[PDB]
Write a sequence for this structure.
């Protein structure tokens, strides 16, 4: 009987450890869930804004081309004036 | 190909002990290898190997062709031996660099997918659906129109 | 989609690579031998007198000095080029493998199968307590 | 590989000794560094009672021992006990004789020279190792993250130090070492628990208070709001069962114990918290590498495992730093063993294989060799 | 970097550090022996320069590969 | 002793269940860690490309400003020389 | 391209090395000429840390380097570093071995002979070029404008020189070389920024002050009116973001930094500004070519890129010059690379193809060949 009781105590401590494992696993998993969601949202927003900037940059390219051509014209006019 | 049959011929008894333990675990008595998807992963993780859960999903999605869950022990043993990592780094990076130096007939700092096709044609081999398309597609995986040295390495990295 | 062709591709690539290796080795041996035969003229055991042989000796000494100057110049060029190649190898290492350096490591080899370690310790403690009684 | 042998990556630490062979993922044997002589008389004859239980054995017989740590604040104050700890670590927890293995100890920054010299003299004379090398505890933690820049805050149990590194070039004039660490938090928790009635005094009960701190305490995101909430509701009171029953209930002591890190005025220390010594350590650096250090702030060490610290620290630094810079705090899940993982990586490198202090070199220059080129 | 040192080192290896010696002052048998020795040494040097040309070609291939890798990686 | 044996076997089956729960949590942990690593790498790339775009937009904007002002001045001068 | 042989038009300069093959429109590789050894200790092993980062690589790691220009004022003060810069330029930025390409260096007027002779000796012995030729930096800038007369003011970063030329016949007695240039303006800006609280001291922060000068400073049309306006309103204060945040606001430092060009008494120099040394250089010329020089005043060099300088200079010269002459200031938009474009044009000419200093000629007369007929 005493040997069996010793066995029981061992099983008790092992069950305790198992529940401990369960709790720590859950906590870490919830943490990583939070980080996952925040990272995903921020990634989405960052991609959106970067694409916006790209579009504006292309528009600026076209504007610059227009201005360059007009400056060429004015320069030719001025030199002929000279 | 014949490599699976040769591996069956050279069955490593060290891994055969683990595979017979897997036999006993799966076969609960007069059982026809029902192929339990969770059992496959439990056995693979139990045997000390590091199966990617990607490969476990592969095993889930590529079994039971008869539709009744019964799978031949020959095929199951073949899958188990092949999915287990039995290779040594697939030659050396220096050897691969020397081979790529050999393969650069164009001498333009890299090789070409059609150059690979022509050279493999010179090897005197029949090309089929297994050949031709995916071989050249995966040679230039980044699809640069030419297979560079890094692409050459990544195509056959860790390959014997 | 499949990846079974990798094995036969491996076999074919290995065969053709070995063929290229042996071919280049044989061609290199042939070309170096013919180059040496064109540049290294074998000496003669007859046909030249003492004065002729000593004149040939001094002329060959001058020619050997010239070709050794050429060889030392090209050797210095090759040493500088190989130092530059090593420098570029270090440069590309910094460019690419500065992130890949910590990737190479071997872990999880022993503690992965220490499930019974606590059981073994408790068994030893029980054995000691039994020896006590 | 081939001939040759494996290196022993020991890491003395202060509170937990972590050791193991080079090239693995985790230390092989981790056990508290305490040596406790028995204090009562002892009446049973032939029980086989030893004179000093070290390591994890003295955490099971701690009811009748007087545990005393041999390392106070990074420095080693009791050399005989430290020698005993090392002997135990080599022979019983790893079972490898030191005559056939190089060793790689670790040392906090800005420590007394005599400590390091005595350490190398012991390793070469008593244990008689082939070659040993001493490395700063923060560079290893930077190795383990796989980075090459970044400012690492290694808040151990003995001492908290903050070493900034850029492109592999350490900045020796910007190391800010502060002596608040886990042990002072344990003492402060043991001191504020007395406000509810629980008195822990014995050096054995310090371990119980340490367990309470590990399992229950957490760092509050905002201190005043938590103090107000814990004083009205009762959603925070978590209970804990002592080693004999009589459960205890911790109220607002939960987030007040680790708050000492950000307000060292609680334990009477003058200096600023770990949230402001990092910003000061950054501002001492040059003006062109501050963005990279802002973006690659690394946490390590045991005490940085409190739930919710990687957000409080980021909020504080974002408050201090200019609004344009991005503040990112790297908090790997393997924080506790980060220093040892980095030590294993460093010992496994081929380029590092000629930096060891070979024994013949020590025989020619004495223990003062460590301060020389072989750092 | 003290290019004078580079020039003097090149000159020394040209005319001093190398095996510089006038040898046509020996008896017939000994002169023939020394001429054979010098011929074998210069045969070794010709093999050396062949290998130098080969490795220079290989290193040119390697630097081209490095340039291609840099271009594709940036 | 019989009662104790009963409790021993019950705790035994409980311990086996505990071990299985532990392994399941372990696998979940590895999985979520993998996911987080991937998403964070994507975050790095997204932020960096955003920064590149923003910088280029800034530079093009400035150049546009300069050239436009020069063109306007030269236009005024063209009228003057008329 | 293909067969044939192209020339390398290098242009050492002082502050930016500009190089490229002859016959193009713009230099292929433009990068600062700085060589910076690391200054801290360095703790990471195997990081692949070099001993000297040159060119544009040292403008990214400048946080832990000590950058030092190898060319002070036109002249070269540190020959080893200059050799390193040339080696980098040939092998890594152009990737063309110099054994198969003629080179066309450029040199400021009135420079020491030993500098030029050492330059040609290096190019012929170390890099072993087939043939090299040295040209005065102002004649090229006159080539690029497509003129054949005119007085060119080439205000570089090292030295400002003013070479008048008529009908292709240079006037050697009318060259006025002044040593105020962009570097002194950077130092003066760094010195007047201290009046608001911003202190830049490190040699790395000189680059930040240079960026401030490039992006914000402008030349005032009338100095006193601007000084009065900036002291009453606040329409001038433009802000700028440092490499780490903490934006700064530049007030009347904007037009006071480049004003030093027209009043060199600010930095203690005695001489007259660039507005009066041009008029003096003209007045030394003969009485019959002064109208043409007045009408064809050419600007070049980097430092003449300040917004609003082509009007201030014209106003000043019109004040000095007789009322009847027409004063015109040629300020092409491609001012910075004007010297290199002219160098490309000159190297692409067929008539010039026999002026190179062939190597056999150098072997026969030594490095002193450069002062001879092959100028």
């Amino acid at each position: 009987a005493q040997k069996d009781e010793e066995k029981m105590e061992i099983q008790e401590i092992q069950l305790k450890e198992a529940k401990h494992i369960a709790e720590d696993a859950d906590r870490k998993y919830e943490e990583v869930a939070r980080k996952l969601v925040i990272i995903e949202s921020d990634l989405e927003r960052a991609e959106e804004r970067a694409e916006l900037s790209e579009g504006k940059c292309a528009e600026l390219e076209e504007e610059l081309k227009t201005v360059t051509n007009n400056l060429k014209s004015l320069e030719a006019q001025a030199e002929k004036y000279s | 190909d014949d490599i699976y049959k040769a591996a069956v011929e050279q069955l490593t008894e060290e891994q055969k002990n683990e595979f017979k333990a897997a036999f006993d675990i799966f076969v609960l008595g007069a059982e026809d290898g029902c192929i339990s998807t969770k059992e496959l992963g439990k056995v693979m993780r139990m045997l000390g190997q590091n199966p990617t859960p990607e490969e476990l999903q592969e095993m889930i999605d590529e079994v039971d062709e008869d539709g009744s869950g019964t799978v031949d022990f020959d095929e199951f043993l073949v899958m188990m031996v092949r999915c287990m990592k039995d290779d040594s780094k697939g030659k050396s990076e220096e050897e691969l660099s020397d081979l790529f130096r050999m393969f650069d007939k164009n001498a333009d700092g890299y090789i070409d997918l059609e150059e690979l096709k022509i050279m493999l044609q010179a090897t005197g081999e029949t090309i089929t659906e297994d050949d031709i398309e995916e071989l050249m597609k995966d040679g230039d995986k980044n699809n640069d129109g030419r297979i560079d040295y890094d692409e050459f390495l990544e195509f056959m990295k860790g390959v014997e | 989609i499949s990846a079974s062709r990798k094995l036969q591709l491996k076999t074919l690539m290995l065969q053709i690579a070995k063929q290229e290796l042996e071919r280049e080795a044989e061609e290199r041996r042939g070309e170096k031998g013919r180059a040496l035969s064109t540049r290294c003229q074998p000496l003669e055991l007859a046909g030249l007198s003492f004065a002729e042989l000593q004149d040939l000796c001094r002329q060959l000494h001058a020619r050997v000095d010239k070709v050794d100057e050429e060889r030392y110049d090209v050797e210095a060029k090759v040493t500088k080029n190989i130092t530059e190649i090593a420098d570029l190898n270090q440069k590309i290492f910094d460019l690419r493998g500065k992130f890949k350096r910590p990737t190479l490591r071997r872990v999880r080899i022993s503690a992965d199968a220490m499930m019974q370690a606590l059981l073994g310790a408790r068994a030893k403690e029980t054995l000691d307590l039994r020896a006590h009684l | 590989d081939d001939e040759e042998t494996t290196a022993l990556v020991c890491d003395n630490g202060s509170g937990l000794v972590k050791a193991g062979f080079a090239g693995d993922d985790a230390p092989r044997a981790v056990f508290p560094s305490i040596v406790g002589r028995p204090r009562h008389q002892g009446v049973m004859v032939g029980m086989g009672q030893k004179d000093s239980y070290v390591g994890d054995e003295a955490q099971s017989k701690r009811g009748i021992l007087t545990l005393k740590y041999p390392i106070e604040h990074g420095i080693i104050t009791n050399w005989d006990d430290m020698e005993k700890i090392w002997h135990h670590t080599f022979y019983n927890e790893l079972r490898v004789a030191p005559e056939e293995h190089p060793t790689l100890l670790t040392e906090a920054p800005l420590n007394p020279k005599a400590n390091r010299e005595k350490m190398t003299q012991i390793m070469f004379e008593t244990f008689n190792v082939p070659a040993m090398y001493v490395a700063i505890q923060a560079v290893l933690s930077l190795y383990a993250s796989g980075r090459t820049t970044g400012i690492v805050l290694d808040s151990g149990d003995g001492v908290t130090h903050n070493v900034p590194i850029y492109e592999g070039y350490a900045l020796p004039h910007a190391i800010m070492r502060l002596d608040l660490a886990g042990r002072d938090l344990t003492d402060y928790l043991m001191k504020i628990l007395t406000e509810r009635g629980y008195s822990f005094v014995t050096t054995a009960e310090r371990e119980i208070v340490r367990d309470i701190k590990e399992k229950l305490c957490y760092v509050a995101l905002d201190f005043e709001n938590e103090m107000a909430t814990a004083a009205s509701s009762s959603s925070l009171e978590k209970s804990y069962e002592l080693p004999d029953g009589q459960v205890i209930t911790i109220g607002n002591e939960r987030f007040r114990c680790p708050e000492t890190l950000f307000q060292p005025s609680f334990i009477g220390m003058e200096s600023a918290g770990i949230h402001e010594t990092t910003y000061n350590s950054i501002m001492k650096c040059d003006i062109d590498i501050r963005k990279d250090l802002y973006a690659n702030n690394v946490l390590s060490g045991g005490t940085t495992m409190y739930p919710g610290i990687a957000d409080r620290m980021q909020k504080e630094i974002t408050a201090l730093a200019p609004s344009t810079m991005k503040i990112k705090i790297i908090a790997p899940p393997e924080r506790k063993y980060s220093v040892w993982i980095g030590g294993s990586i460093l010992a496994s490198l081929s380029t590092f294989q000629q930096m060891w202090i070979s024994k013949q070199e020590y025989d020619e220059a004495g223990p003062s060799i460590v301060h020389r080129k072989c750092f | 970097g003290k290019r004078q040192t580079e020039r003097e080192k090149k000159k020394k290896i040209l005319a001093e550090r190398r095996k510089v010696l006038a040898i046509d002052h020996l008896n017939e048998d000994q002169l023939r022996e020394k001429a054979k020795e010098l011929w074998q040494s210069i045969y070794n040097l010709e093999a050396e320069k062949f290998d130098l040309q080969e490795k220079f070609k290989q290193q040119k291939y390697e630097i081209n590969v490095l340039r291609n890798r840099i271009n594709d990686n940036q």
Notes: Residues 9-42 of chain C form one domain.
